[PDB]
Structure formats: structure tokens, C-alpha cells
Design a protein around this ligand. Structure first.
Ligand SMILES: OC[C@H]1O[C@@](CO)(O[C@H]2O[C@H](CO)[C@@H](O)[C@H](O)[C@H]2O)[C@@H](O)[C@@H]1O
Ligand code: MWP
Lengths: 141, 139
């Protein structure tokens, strides 16, 4: 698994849309709640993500939001290879349910769940969080 | 420290730009928000802390930071509250503004350009490489 590969996926909750980007090699995630899976929101999500991390390749579910010209033009501007149809929503929903009663709004609880996921030590006390893994995988010097 | 950030706001076309700068690297995160409110501030900070190791954020004096929701977000996330990379962002947004209809988009292009731009000749690093290098070194 190359360090520049992300998987993008969507999850629906309380009638709202959660776009999730998973850095495949570390398990690190980024997520936003969006009003609906349109091309403008997808392009915007991908542009932000690509500005924050080295994004070489995105694997998608090939939803209609990805075939939109807006999103193709975003990947092109940002130098992203878009790979439609190339194959933890359950995990993120579980964690959202554990913080859900501390947030007045879903979107807040989503960011709380992201924080928790990315900080969680994976595989024992000597292991590493997703956050530690991504920076270790990506640091070049 | 790897964990020190500075947050500032920029006003433009009647929208507000919240800019967080990672002080040791120059790396930026930015969002356009309809208005500089306590709720938008809290959400911005919560997103930042889930994405990078945020220990301390230095802020301007303003009321958005006094909010009880900001205080709750900070307490939950372990954040303690206490220019060159800023007017540079505004210059970049200018250079690319015509490439996009909405300000939001131009802002995110400019954050992309800033964080990927090699400083110096062959041998140089971008702000994005500095931050990951600083933080990986610290682990
Ligand atoms: O410019 C707002 C822009 O950001 C999105 C998510 O991609 O909205 C989320 O992030 C904003 C910035 O912090 C918040 O203001 C917003 O409340 C939050 O859902 C976009 O949907 C939106 O167009
Ligand atoms: N090359 C490289 C390494 C890390 C990072 C970037 C580039 S970035 O600037 O895109 C953000 C983090």
C-alpha cells in the first residue's frame, strides 16, 4: 500500500451525510458532515484533504458524486488519480454513539469520533495510533 | 513544540477565514465560515485537534474564544488556550481567485499551494514536509 492512497466512502446517519477519507496504510481518518453527496461538496472535500496531506490516489465507491465534472476537475487541479470502483464505517458509527450524548449536533459528535479514532493505540500498549502511523509512513526526512 | 498553533481570522468579501498556523513548520489549516461565532470556532478547533497533535493554541483576544462551547471543546480535546505565513495566504488567494467562483474554493487552493510549495532550491522542504518531519521525529 503506497503512502498516497486514500479510500473515500460515505456514511449516512440521522438523515445526514458523512464523507470519510481513510488513509489506507495507517487507518488515519478525516471526515465532514455534508448536507448531501453533491459534486460541489465532494470536490470541496477532496480539495481540502489534498491541501492537508499528500494525496496521490483516491479509491472511490463510484457514486454519482464522483462522476461529476466538478470532482474530476478538482482531482486534475490537485494532481490526484481518481480510481472509481476499486474496493470502518461500522467503527466510526460505534464511536459516534459513544460520544453522541455529549454534543448538541451530529457534526460535533462526528469530529469527536474522528479524534478518538485517530488517537487510539492499536495493537497493545507498545503499539501506535493511526495519527502516529500516518506521519511515520509519510515523513521523508 | 510540535504541538503549538496560532489561530487568526481574516475578513474578506464579507465572509471570515479562520487560519491555523503550525508555528514550527508554517503549515496551515483554513476554513471559510459564514461568521466568526463561538460555535464555528469550537468546531474548527475540534477538527484541528482530531487531525494533528494540538497542545496549545495562541489566539487574538476575541469573544469567540471565550464562549462556553469553545471552552468545552478545548477541555474535551486537551487544548490549552494562550503574520508572514498569514498575509502570504492572502497573497496566494489573490493569485488564484479567478480560477474559482466561490471564495471557499480559492481559499482551499491557496492552502494547497502554501503547504506543498518547496521553499529554497534543491535541498528544500515544503511546510507540509516540515510538519510531518517535526512530528514523526518527536514520536
Ligand atoms: O465552508 C464550509 C464548508 O465546510 C464543510 C465540510 O466540507 O462544512 C463543515 O466545515 C465547515 C468549516 O469549519 C463548517 O462551517 C460546517 O459547519 C461543517 O459542516 C462544507 O459542507 C461547507 O461548504
Ligand atoms: N511530500 C509531502 C510529505 C508530507 C506532506 C506533504 C507533502 S503535504 O504538503 O502535501 C502535507 C504533508
Amino acid at each position: 500500500s503506497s503512502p498516497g492512497i486514500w479510500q473515500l466512502d460515505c456514511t449516512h446517519l440521522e438523515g445526514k451525510v458523512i464523507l470519510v477519507a481513510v488513509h489506507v496504510a495507517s487507518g488515519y481518518i478525516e471526515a465532514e458532515v455534508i448536507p448531501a453527496e453533491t459534486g460541489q461538496e465532494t470536490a470541496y472535500f477532496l480539495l481540502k484533504l489534498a491541501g492537508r496531506w499528500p494525496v496521490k490516489t483516491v479509491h472511490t465507491d463510484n457514486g454519482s458524486n464522483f462522476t461529476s465534472t466538478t470532482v474530476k476537475a478538482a482531482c486534475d487541479w490537485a494532481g490526484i488519480k481518481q480510481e472509481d470502483g476499486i474496493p470502518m464505517n461500522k467503527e466510526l458509527k460505534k464511536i459516534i454513539g459513544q460520544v453522541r450524548d455529549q454534543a448538541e449536533h451530529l457534526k460535533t459528535a462526528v469530529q469527536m469520533a474522528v479524534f478518538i479514532h485517530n488517537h487510539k493505540r492499536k495493537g497493545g500498549i507498545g503499539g501506535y495510533s493511526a495519527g502516529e502511523r500516518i506521519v511515520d509512513i509519510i515523513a521523508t526526512d
